[PDB]
Amino acid sequence: MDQKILSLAAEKTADKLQEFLQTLREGDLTNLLQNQAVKGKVAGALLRAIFKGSPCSEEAGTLRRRKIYTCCIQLVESGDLQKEIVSEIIGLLMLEAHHFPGPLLVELANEFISAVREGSLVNGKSLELLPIILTVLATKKENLLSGEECKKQLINTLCSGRWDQQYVIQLTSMFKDVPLTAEEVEFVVEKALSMFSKMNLQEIPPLVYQLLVLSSKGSRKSVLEGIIAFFSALDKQHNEEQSPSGELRHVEGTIILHIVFAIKLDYELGRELVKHLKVGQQGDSNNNLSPFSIALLLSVTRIQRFQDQVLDLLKT
Amino acid sequence: MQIFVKTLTGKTITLEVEPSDTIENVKAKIQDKEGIPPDQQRLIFAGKQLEDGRTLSDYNIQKESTLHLVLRLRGG
Amino acid sequence: NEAEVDTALDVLLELVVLNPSAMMMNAVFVKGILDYLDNISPQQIRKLFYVLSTLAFSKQNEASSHIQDDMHLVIRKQLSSTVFKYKLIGIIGAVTMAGIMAADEQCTQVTSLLQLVHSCSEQSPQASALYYDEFANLIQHEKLDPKALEWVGQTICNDFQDAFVVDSCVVPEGDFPFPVKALYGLEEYDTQNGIAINLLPLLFSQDSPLCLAPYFRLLRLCVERQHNGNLEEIDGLLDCPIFLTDLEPGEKLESMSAKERSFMCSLIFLTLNWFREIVNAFCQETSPEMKGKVLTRLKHIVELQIILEKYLAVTPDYVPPLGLLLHNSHAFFRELDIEVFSILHCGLVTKFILLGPPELLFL
């Protein structure tokens, strides 16, 4: 039941495609999942008929569009399907989010938010849509509350919502590509850093990578504060357990290596770091440093631009 | 023998290789099971950047010990 | 820092032009720059790609053409990205690369390169703009092998003269809330011309026109390089009025301030920049009637800027920043050329006591 829709999306637009949407009416799930079971190539071409024939100039096309979007969010999350088909469909959905009126994206976004609460997020490739829709929201500056307020409520839900400890890294990476304020990057980093406590260890460094490259456009002192508090406190936990190492110090080393390599790009991070661990008044050097921070600085040293200031700091 | 790698998306991945084997072999296996070519890969264990000509015996790397990866995009 | 960087790249260029074969063994160390390119200012990027490219495209170093395909590759990658900077960075490198290899398969290769950087840059307006601008700068400063130039100009002239150029048809396309008319003709020309500019329908369809002025700049420099300063194909272009709103009144339509005000304001802005490049163009021409028409255009300019500052005074913050009045003077407008001030050879005509004064103020 497929070739009577490529005979619609070839000749004319909105004369015969829109009529198909109202006339069929039986469903939009059984025809797509099972279409991929025989020939996946047809499925990628079927979606190219719906979105060309359902523009958001009219209500019915917009609601058909919303239903196909929710159903594709379901199947991409559900199906143990071929990887290239998943890459294709997420690319197709990514291409079409541009001419959408304001008050439709709230539903898809709240669906994604409910997904972070409960959803089986086996793939974070469903979460690739969340970046673009929040920018397509903010560019629509009319009463949906204006677009930015819906965005901020959404971010507050995303942070204040509870995070499936496995797939929080991908969630964290989604905030990377959206242009945010200092306040919203601050919200995500402070909560995401509060998440560090309630985890396995070994996932943390790439998390830190994503945190850092996001931190390049926001609050970075906040991240280093949280980092050093985390690792200094746990070092003391280890010291008192002594008076759990062979992995722990390893992960530390790797983290240090990540942040050195990221400073290698952005030097402002270096200067903000060193200002944090500026002794200045000597009492700061009785809350500033840990063994871990020191190890950081001595690793940092290797950058020829930083072999003076770091050493003057440690020495003095 | 089995080992772990973790990456910037948190894809925990399980690599079966003998310790006497070398690192570029693992880059071949990454190009195989994950489709990522060698030259973009940057492999780390415990805060050491791992080179090509070494092996897992050289770095005291053992069973189920977790490696870290990043995508060294020259340009990006 | 920045000054250290600049010094190093000056040094590098001096070495490679002097002692290239020495540098060729260190080619990998030169490529070892290529990670920290986000960290560095665009002008340094221009200089960087210059040095890599002149190292690559030397007639002796066609032995080691591995670096050649590598740098071709990375540029194709950098352009392939969606991001403003990566597309832009590639554009800049690609332009410089193209230009230096431009001094017959070489011609086909640079041709494919410009076609594909366009095809990649076709969609983003500021990126397409910067392409045009950098291409322009490259033709301006540098001289080379007119075969590529005669090739690409045949494309460019056709593209422009089909894109925005239309008939002097009093009826245009597009249902506006505005009385569209052919405004700012000289009127000493023949009013039945097949040359006029479909501007406001291109705008309302935009709601391609941002790139206009620089595309003309590029076109002009191309024509001058081809026919050696002969714009007889274009000399009947400044005879164009433009199919626009009744732009003149910015007081009768007061207190209905909507996106229509933004339309009008940025429209006038574009108009001004268009004229600005026109006067940059037809300054050198010794024809006295041409210069009279230039000064007609300057009278248009001053009244238009007056109208627009009035529009902004009445409607405060419907601001086009497009890459308060002090900001608008210098950067957001087109930098005029030096030889434009050939106009100063003319003598003033006072209006009261008895070439207007306020255009002289402007200059």
Swiss-Prot record, chain B:
The record marks H68 as: Essential for function. Residues 1-76 form the Ubiquitin-like domain. Changing G76A: Loss of ADP-ribosylation. Impairs ubiquitination by CRL2(KLHDC3) E3 ligase complex. No effect on ubiquitination by CRL2(KLHDC10) E3 ligase complex. Changing K63R: Abolishes HLTF-mediated polyubiquitination of PCNA. There is a cross-link at K6, K11, K27, K29, K33, K48, K63 (Glycyl lysine isopeptide (Lys-Gly) (interchain with G-Cter in ubiquitin)). There is a cross-link at G76 (Glycyl lysine isopeptide (Gly-Lys) (interchain with K-? in acceptor proteins)). The chain holds residues 1 to 76 of 685 of the full protein. The modification Phosphoserine is found at S65. The modification ADP-ribosylglycine is found at G76. This is Ubiquitin. Changing R72G: No effect on ADP-ribosylation.
From Swiss-Prot, chain C:
Changing K77R: Abolishes ubiquitination; impairs chromatin binding, foci formation and DNA repair. Abolishes interaction with MTMR15/FAN1. One of its GO terms (molecular function) is DNA polymerase binding. It is found in: Nucleus. GO terms for cellular component: chromatin; condensed chromosome; cytosol; DNA repair complex; nuclear body; nucleolus; nucleoplasm; nucleus. One of its GO terms (biological process) is brain morphogenesis. Keywords: Cell cycle, Disease variant, DNA damage, DNA repair, Fanconi anemia, Isopeptide bond, Nucleus, Phosphoprotein, Ubl conjugation. Monoubiquitinated on Lys-77 during S phase and upon genotoxic stress by FANCL in complex with E2 ligases UBE2T or UBE2W (isoform 1 and isoform 2). Deubiquitinated by USP1 as cells enter G2/M, or once DNA repair is completed. Monoubiquitination requires the joint intervention of the FANC core complex, including FANCA, FANCB, FANCC, FANCE, FANCF, FANCG, and FANCM, and proteins involved in cell cycle checkpoints and DNA repair, including RPA1, ATR, CHEK1 and BRCA1, and is mediated by FANCL/PHF9. Monoubiquitination prevents DNA release from the FANCI-FANCD2 complex. There is a cross-link at K77 (Glycyl lysine isopeptide (Lys-Gly) (interchain with G-Cter in ubiquitin)). It is linked to Fanconi anemia complementation group D2: A disorder affecting all bone marrow elements and resulting in anemia, leukopenia and thrombopenia. It is associated with cardiac, renal and limb malformations, dermal pigmentary changes, and a predisposition to the development of malignancies. At the cellular level it is associated with hypersensitivity to DNA-damaging agents, chromosomal instability (increased chromosome breakage) and defective DNA repair. Belongs to the Fanconi anemia protein FANCD2 family. Homodimer; cannot be ubiquitinated and does not bind DNA. Part of a FANCI-FANCD2 heterodimeric complex that binds and scans dsDNA for DNA damage. Interacts directly with FANCE and FANCI. Interacts with USP1 and MEN1. The ubiquitinated form specifically interacts with BRCA1 and BLM. Both the nonubiquitinated and the monoubiquitinated forms interact with BRCA2; this interaction is mediated by phosphorylated FANCG and the complex also includes XCCR3. The ubiquitinated form specifically interacts with MTMR15/FAN1 (via UBZ-type zinc finger), leading to recruit MTMR15/FAN1 to sites of DNA damage. This is Fanconi anemia group D2 protein. It comes from Homo sapiens. The gene is FANCD2. The chain holds residues 485 to 968 of 1451 of the full protein.
